[PDB]
Curated annotation (Swiss-Prot):
It comes from Cryphonectria parasitica (Chestnut blight fungus). It comes from the Eukaryota. The chain holds residues 90 to 419 of 419 of the full protein. Keywords: Aspartyl protease, Disulfide bond, Hydrolase, Protease, Signal, Zymogen. GO terms for biological process: proteolysis. The gene is EAPA. Disulfide bonds join C255-C290. This is Endothiapepsin. It catalyses: Hydrolysis of proteins with specificity similar to that of pepsin A, prefers hydrophobic residues at P1 and P1', but does not cleave 14-Ala-|-Leu-15 in the B chain of insulin or Z-Glu-Tyr. Clots milk. The active site is at D35, S199. Belongs to the peptidase A1 family. One of its GO terms (molecular function) is aspartic-type endopeptidase activity.
């Protein structure tokens, strides 16, 4: 089997991407944030504290003839950005772009943190990291991909995120028309439960490539590109007036700037992030100070190849017995 679904930016900045997901019988369609940095499929629901729901579409398990309460199971997750959610668990039928899993754990939120409430466009998350990170207790549950894998034509999914435009998540096949040149594959460590890999280096604009190993995670659920402070400083030094602002929370730059591109290495291959991908707009409405899309990972504890990086590529998440990642230009 295969599946193919369009993923759409939630706003004009590509702050996140939503993909429609069918849950239950009859189908209840929710728009979920596909997150290769986590491993829980959780949804706003009829059980979510009412004051914490503000415009989201909810899953109502009592209206699904295929929903079954997973007795005794609870979940609770905290994300790198400080947000969190928790609740109980159903199993139900879940379909993405024509690919169906029966008995998928659907984690129903009883509580969500303010940032989730405040984002009306995201109805929940669909985790695509390794199932070892799944938070369901006392019996850990499998991700949608993990459940689908054996049925797929090939045990892979691909992320093709757009810049200011829709893109595609495919399951079970590689669309050879969706990228240019070749896909370069690179080793993955699953030891921390992430799609963790090592970039071979970087360049800023038309500058020379610096060969240096950068370990980090391919994370579709993180907006920006978080890299070591040395790398980030080298980038922003090429933008007149750019500075790191403790009050804002990272590098800012004059909105009148033309940003240079940023290149990262995948083996001997190179992915070029155009300068415009690195512009996240005014820090506050009407400001002429703009927020940068490349930020320091110092104090995160890990480098994160988030959407800023991934949207410059066609990305293969290869869930073979020994997982690997593939990157192509597009």
């Amino acid at each position: 089997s295969t599946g193919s679904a369009t993923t759409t930016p939630i706003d004009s900045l590509d702050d996140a991407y939503i993909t429609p997901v069918q849950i239950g019988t009859p189908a209840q369609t929710l728009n979920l944030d596909f997150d290769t940095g986590s491993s829980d499929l959780w949804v706003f629901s009829s059980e979510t504290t009412a004051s914490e729901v503000d415009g989201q579409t909810i899953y109502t398990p009592s209206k699904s003839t295929t929903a079954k309460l997973l007795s005794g199971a609870t979940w609770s997750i905290s994300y790198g950005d400080g947000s969190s959610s928790s609740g109980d668990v159903y199993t139900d039928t879940v379909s993405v772009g024509g690919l169906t899993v029966t008995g998928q754990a659907v984690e129903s939120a009883k509580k969500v943190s303010s940032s989730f409430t405040e984002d009306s466009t995201i109805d929940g998350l669909l985790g695509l990291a390794f199932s070892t990170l799944n938070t369901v207790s006392p019996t850990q549950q499998k991700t949608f991909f993990d459940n689908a894998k054996a049925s797929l034509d090939s045990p892979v999914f691909t992320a093709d995120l757009g810049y200011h435009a829709p893109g595609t998540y495919n399951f079970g096949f590689i669309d050879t028309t969706a990228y240019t040149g070749s896909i370069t594959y690179t080793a993955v460590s699953t030891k921390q439960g992430f799609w963790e890999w090592t970039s071979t280096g970087y360049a800023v604009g038309s500058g020379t490539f610096k060969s240096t190993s950068i370990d980090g995670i391919a994370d579709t659920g993180t907006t920006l590109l978080y890299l070591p402070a040395t790398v980030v400083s080298a980038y922003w030094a090429q933008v007149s007036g750019a500075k790191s602002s403790s009050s804002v929370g990272g590098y800012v730059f004059p909105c009148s700037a033309t940003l240079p591109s940023f290149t990262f290495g995948v083996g001997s291959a190179r992915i070029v992030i155009p300068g415009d991908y690195i512009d996240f707009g005014p820090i506050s409405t009407g400001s002429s100070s703009c927020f940068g899309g490349i930020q320091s990972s110092a104090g995160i504890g890990i480098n994160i190849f988030g959407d800023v990086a991934l949207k410059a590529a066609f990305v293969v998440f290869n869930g073979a017995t020994t997982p690997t990642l593939g990157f192509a230009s597009k």
